[PDB]
Design a protein around this ligand. Sequence first.
Ligand code: BCL
Ligand code: BCL
Ligand code: BCL
Ligand code: BCL
Ligand code: BCL
Ligand code: BCL
Ligand code: BCL
Ligand code: G2O
Ligand code: SF4
Ligand code: SF4
Ligand SMILES: [Ca+2]
Lengths: 110, 100, 364, 645
Amino acid sequence: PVENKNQAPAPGKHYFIIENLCVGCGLCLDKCPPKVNAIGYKFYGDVQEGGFRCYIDQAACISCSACFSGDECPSGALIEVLPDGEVLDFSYTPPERLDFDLRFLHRFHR
Amino acid sequence: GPWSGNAVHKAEKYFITSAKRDRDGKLQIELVPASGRRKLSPTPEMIRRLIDGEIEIYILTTQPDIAIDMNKEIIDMENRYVIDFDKRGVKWTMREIPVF
Amino acid sequence: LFGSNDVTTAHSDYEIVLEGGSSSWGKVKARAKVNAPPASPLLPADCDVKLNVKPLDPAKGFVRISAVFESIVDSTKNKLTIEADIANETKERRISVGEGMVSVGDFSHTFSFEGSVVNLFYYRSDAVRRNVPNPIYMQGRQFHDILMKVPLDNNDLIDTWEGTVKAIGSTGAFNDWIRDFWFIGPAFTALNEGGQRISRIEVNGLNTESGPKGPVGVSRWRFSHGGSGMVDSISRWAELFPSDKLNRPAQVEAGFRSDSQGIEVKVDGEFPGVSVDAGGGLRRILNHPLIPLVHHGMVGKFNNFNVDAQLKVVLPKGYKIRYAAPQYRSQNLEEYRWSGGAYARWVEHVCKGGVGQFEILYAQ
Amino acid sequence: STKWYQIFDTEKLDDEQVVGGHLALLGVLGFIMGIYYISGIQVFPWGAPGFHDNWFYLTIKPRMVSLGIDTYSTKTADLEAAGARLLGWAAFHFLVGSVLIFGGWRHWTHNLTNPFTGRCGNFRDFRFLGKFGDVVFNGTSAKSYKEALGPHAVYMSLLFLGWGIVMWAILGFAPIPDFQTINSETFMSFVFAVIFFALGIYWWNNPPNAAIHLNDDMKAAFSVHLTAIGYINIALGCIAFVAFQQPSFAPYYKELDKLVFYLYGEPFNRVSFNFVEQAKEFADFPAYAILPKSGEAFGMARVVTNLIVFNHIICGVLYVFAGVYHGGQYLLKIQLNGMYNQIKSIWITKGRDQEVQVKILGTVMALCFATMLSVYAVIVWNTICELNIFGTNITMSFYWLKPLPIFQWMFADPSINDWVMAHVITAGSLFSLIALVRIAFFAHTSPLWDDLGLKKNSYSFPCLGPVYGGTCGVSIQDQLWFAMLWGIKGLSAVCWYIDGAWIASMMYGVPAADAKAWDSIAHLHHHYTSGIFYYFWTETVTIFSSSHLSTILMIGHLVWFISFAVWFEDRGSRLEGADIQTRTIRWLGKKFLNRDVNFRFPVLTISDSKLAGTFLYFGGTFMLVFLFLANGFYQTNSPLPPPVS
Ligand code: BCL
Ligand code: BCL
Ligand code: BCL
Ligand code: BCL
Ligand code: BCL
Ligand code: BCL
Ligand code: BCL
Ligand code: G2O
Ligand code: SF4
Ligand code: SF4
Ligand SMILES: [Ca+2]
């Protein structure tokens, strides 16, 4: 009989890099502001065999997190340590899955 | 297979935090996977996984060195540390700040 | 025109290869791909279940089962392995001695258990078995006397054991509230939704013993699992246990992979109790246990779906199909394939938890 | 990094946004069609001459002839009627395109208000029409692409029925089932209306489920539809080539050879340095006026057929490549998002296992290598035999190798040329499919990058550095560029075959002996224009004759060898050179400027350098292939005699 009013428009930090893992691509350098210059190349030997790696100057590097948030690392050397101590290779790693294939017996994929 | 989990790592990459040598040896050595959401302990089942090859634990450098002479003292190249003294362990090296 | 649009689709295949003669063996291969979201609060759940079983010497019986569950849930790895010798002492009692181990993520513990399960129907009337061809509902109750021993090698085990020791003495309502703990998730809902009732456990005294291979917490407890009649674990005690049919080892390699967009189920298995003899010389595929159907009904009614289901009963050359309702779609000389129409309706019925019959009677 | 080619990316667009974009594009396309129709007015209805036969209109023309428009008439009155119909239909296209642009703007702003009735139409929920929508659907597709296929097919059925009606009333083509004559396309339009209405109602009552696309439709559905429509466009090109060669289309295409055309840029009558218009070659035509180019010699019928067929074919191949690339982008997105393990459909789960990817790509590579080696050895051996080096006459060549008699039905004159054409098309298809499969399967990790611990984290990353002495061009964008470069060969084979050329050998028709004796020993009633290398020499006669085609030649060549600069591994050299350029431009200081020169010389990123390189490479290549197809057909039905009896 009686009802109340309604409206509803719905309907109608201290980042580190593991030189053992790093391969020296330098996208961290591109992700770093030029004013800081924290990422730097360190040369070890022949360039074609891996050669140079990259390093962070902890004093110069002040909590930008652009490198890791960009998630551009192919090698996973760009790691982030946390105040509690956990280490991150990637911002979000895919979950590990128990992989086993599906083949219907009567369907064409058997 | 490779797409499940972090695609870089063949085995589950378990970094070792600097939990060490502060109270009766600190047997609760912190093992953290690459995912990093959980923070596990080095129970014998984790050692079973590690000897199975499904997971692999790695020691980092830029931290208080984790029982570096109490876990194992093989220092031929400073990276010959093994848990059960026949492990074939691998250490991650980071001379981050000390190098130019 | 039509109603209930925007339905998802589930594609399912089943194959039951029966064995002729007095052997009631069957080979069940099932596949399923459902595009409906799963009801997992920790959604990315993939579990592989390897249920092997071997005939130990039948002088006393004690067939040996070996179950390996490996479940990755939210990128958490769990594994439960149990190897146990089980034997029907008498028709009503069963005695088992086994070992096992759980291992979640990092924490693992091994247990050695012995168990006496006395199953009694609330009634055994000659008139009922005289008047009904097949009693699917049967009222009864199980009494489990379980003695489980766990070495307390890990500190987590020690803390939990101390907590349990304090709890069993500080609170008498523990015997009740342990049931509240006994159902980790919606299993408490499935208990009453499935017709099962669980009585308060009666502790016979859990004690620690000093073992050379680590200290062992040895807990003896008995609990009563009463059934309204839908419970396969009670009403079908004669079944569930190939006491004399295990003349050969049997296996199951089941598994599922569940994630935000779908569910992928693959079952391979060889079971010794697929076929049940019936009166008049007829043999049938065993009546579906109703606890699976009902417990699946809770999650099966969460989305509107259409099913494309096929089933092939590879019948032995010595038998001809009978009394198949729904009827068979494709008729081979020996095989019989059910698909579409009424069978699809039955699949949609049992996917949502409907306890319906699919009578398939094969005879000479 | 959002660039100027990422602002219109679908990830930032909604469904209504792309609806508005498609409608704006349809309206702009209608405006362009009006431009072309006006450009086809041979004699103005005012009583004056018209436009000089644009290639756009020369392509559009036969289809217009199929309709009541655009009579093939030299009679001035009927040609004026043709111009009147063209202009009227152009104005109608202009009006409809204006309304379509208005609707596209309304859907771009998400501002859907009807001026006559002040109500707001919800994009998520509405009725298609006042009563028809309630008759058929009773509502709207619930914001899911799978539920929209039904209504989309119903709309397509409506459009087919409307096309039949337009043919029935305005263009005066009564539907009869005689498929040889024109007046059955309307009957088939009605048949397709019935069929697609049935399909639409079925798909509305029963929506097909491929749940991969629904979530991120903006890329998954885009990729699937783009690849499907690319294959559809390839099929349309093939069907067009077959049909335009049929006698049924002959009244509408062979008559194009009968009539001459005055093209824009076609050479004019040349006046001398002293022409007193108060000496002139071809004095009958006025000064600086276009000399007529005869269709019979130019082969305008097959020239227009080739333009249409290769336009659709290359557009389809490019659409296939772009569909694969955008599907790779979506797959990379779900691989970084962790949804790749959660798709649960055959189109992904089969490729989820890396060993299956290895097997598929290895099978493709083996087939490509085998077919390519076979056909290339055949080609080079034919060339060797016809040039007689190493003392081999053409009797040792692959002239015996005809297509199988069972398979001979689909060729005019069975020869090694058709064999090599088919084998080259299959080899190039598999050659591009190698890179397409690489995009499909290796968007995140290749088996090498699985063994060597790297992974692709972007769709436009340049490389991974000099580690392992490589890592160049493993991005799906770079694999797309390689696929395009590899399919350039296949598209070139298509163009040269449809234009008419001996692909089975390289120098066919050169003054060498056994090159000329090919036709004598092959028994062909068709004289193919020339061999692969001699094709340029034989077909650039007209390209040089026409100043306009020469201008296109020069511009395309410039574009190509400018692509060279960004294709090579020279970006760092260009960067340091640009820094030197900037330093000297700063040295314009103390050259009396007193102005701070804040102009850093820019150098493209590698992800942008490859983009520009491929765009300019393809652009120059096929700007020149346009001249290949605009030189002429120049195929005479006369076998060559042997040089020596
Ligand atoms: C929209 C409707 C959809 C659908 C939507 C869903 C949804 C939604 C869910 C499932 C779930 C499942 N579905 Mg489904 N599903 C459909 C149709 C199917 C079809 C088919 C097409 O034929 C199949 C094969 C399946 C099969 C399955 C399983 C893979 C899975 C339940 C696992 C289970 O048994 O755990 C067995 C579980 C237990 C036994 C409970 C364990 C815990 C309790 C506390 C302890 C119990 C007692 C213990 C075991 C006793 C041990 C000791 C004794 C000595 C033995 N569904 C229909 C078409 N499906 C669920 C799933 O697992 O999601 C990941 C789920 O959430
Ligand atoms: C699940 C429904 C009932 C139940 C009904 C039964 C039945 C029925 C039996 C037992 C038996 C046992 N139960 Mg119980 N039991 C339940 C709850 C429990 C709980 C608990 C969750 O707290 C515990 C600790 C126990 C404890 C135990 C043991 C004392 C004993 C042997 C276990 C063992 O061998 O398992 C080994 C573990 C498994 C093999 C894991 C998988 C379990 C599933 C149900 C097996 C499915 C079989 C499949 C359909 C066919 C397989 C073919 C393969 C080829 C083998 N029950 C609930 C209340 N219980 C047995 C007995 O009486 O022992 C004396 C027995 O016959
Ligand atoms: C400890 C558990 C109990 C027990 C509990 C049950 C229960 C309860 C049931 C059976 C059922 C069956 N069991 Mg039993 N059963 C026991 C002992 C045995 C042994 C043995 C000699 O060890 C064997 C070989 C069997 C064999 C069989 C068949 C007679 C029958 C299934 C026929 C069918 O077609 O299956 C085809 C079935 C499959 C294709 C699906 C298998 C699915 C998965 C792999 C197993 C079921 C459990 C759950 C869904 C998954 C794991 C959950 C937790 C991780 C434990 N049981 C032990 C002692 N068994 C079922 C039956 O129909 O009873 C009449 C049933 O409901
Ligand atoms: C055969 C029909 C094809 C198709 C042909 C085209 C064409 C042709 C065009 C689009 C355009 C777009 N299409 Mg589409 N597209 C298809 C399928 C889809 C699907 C899908 C099924 O999921 C989606 C979501 C889209 C989404 C989109 C957007 C990226 C964009 C329109 C929105 C916007 O406002 O742009 C904002 C910007 C504008 C509308 C105009 C910007 C200025 C100019 C006109 C852009 C021209 C680009 C380029 C030169 C087009 C060349 C075609 C080649 C000559 C062969 N397409 C089907 C299968 N689509 C246009 C777009 O912008 O492409 C990048 C466009 O050019
Ligand atoms: C230029 C023609 C354009 C166009 C231009 C406009 C303009 C302009 C307006 C809308 C309006 C609306 N448009 Mg529109 N729109 C087009 C195609 C679409 C499509 C589609 C089929 O994919 C969608 C989803 C929409 C979405 C919407 C609706 C939410 C809304 C009308 C509400 C309703 O109940 O109206 C019932 C009728 C509709 C759903 C119309 C559907 C489109 C038809 C084909 C064209 C209508 C305009 C046309 C000039 C009139 C003659 C049509 C012929 C008789 C077929 N448009 C066509 C291709 N549309 C109107 C509005 O917001 O209304 C309140 C409005 O003012
Ligand atoms: C649509 C965007 C532009 C536009 C751009 C073009 C383009 C571009 C072309 C024409 C051409 C034509 N235009 Mg128009 N034109 C528009 C508006 C109109 C309207 C109108 C009232 O909206 C009409 C009646 C016309 C009239 C016509 C004809 C004079 C002529 C031939 C049509 C025909 O064969 O269709 C055939 C009709 C059908 C096949 C059925 C309707 C469409 C179906 C539902 C979609 C599937 C078919 C699709 C077109 C081809 C894909 C085949 C695959 C196998 C799936 N234009 C708007 C403004 N117009 C053509 C031209 O001049 O030829 C030389 C031409 O190619
Ligand atoms: C056949 C209809 C469509 C088609 C419909 C779809 C659909 C639907 C999907 C894709 C998707 C993808 N498409 Mg496709 N796609 C086609 C043509 C292609 C071609 C090509 C040049 O032939 C390529 C390289 C691609 C590329 C791709 C990938 C980016 C992606 C699949 C990755 C994967 O793991 O695949 C694994 C490989 C396979 C499953 C191969 C086997 C294919 C089928 C399922 C099995 C039977 C066919 C049999 C092998 C061949 C013979 C019989 C045929 C009838 C000829 N498409 C045609 C045009 N494509 C998916 C994606 O995510 O899009 C963004 C997606 O959702
Ligand atoms: C017409 C074609 C080309 C140019 C035009 C040109 C311009 C140019 N280039 Mg180039 N290039 C190739 C072709 C052309 N490169 C090829 C095919 C390769 C493959 C190997 C290649 C590769 C490298 C490497 C590796 C490096 C460079 C540079 C460098 C310059 C710096 C200053 C200089 O040399 O001026 C000398 C050059 C000029 C006088 C060019 C300006 C007018 C011009 C006369 C012709 C005008 C053409 C017109 C601009 C086209 C369109 C007009 C209209 C539509 C807008 C510089 C002006 C680099 C440096 O910056 O220092 C040298 C460097 O490191 N390159
Ligand atoms: S966190 Fe900031 S300062 Fe440190 S390397 Fe990254 S961008 Fe440079
Ligand atoms: S992105 Fe990774 S591989 Fe590249 S330089 Fe940084 S740490 Fe090294
Ligand atoms: Ca030519």
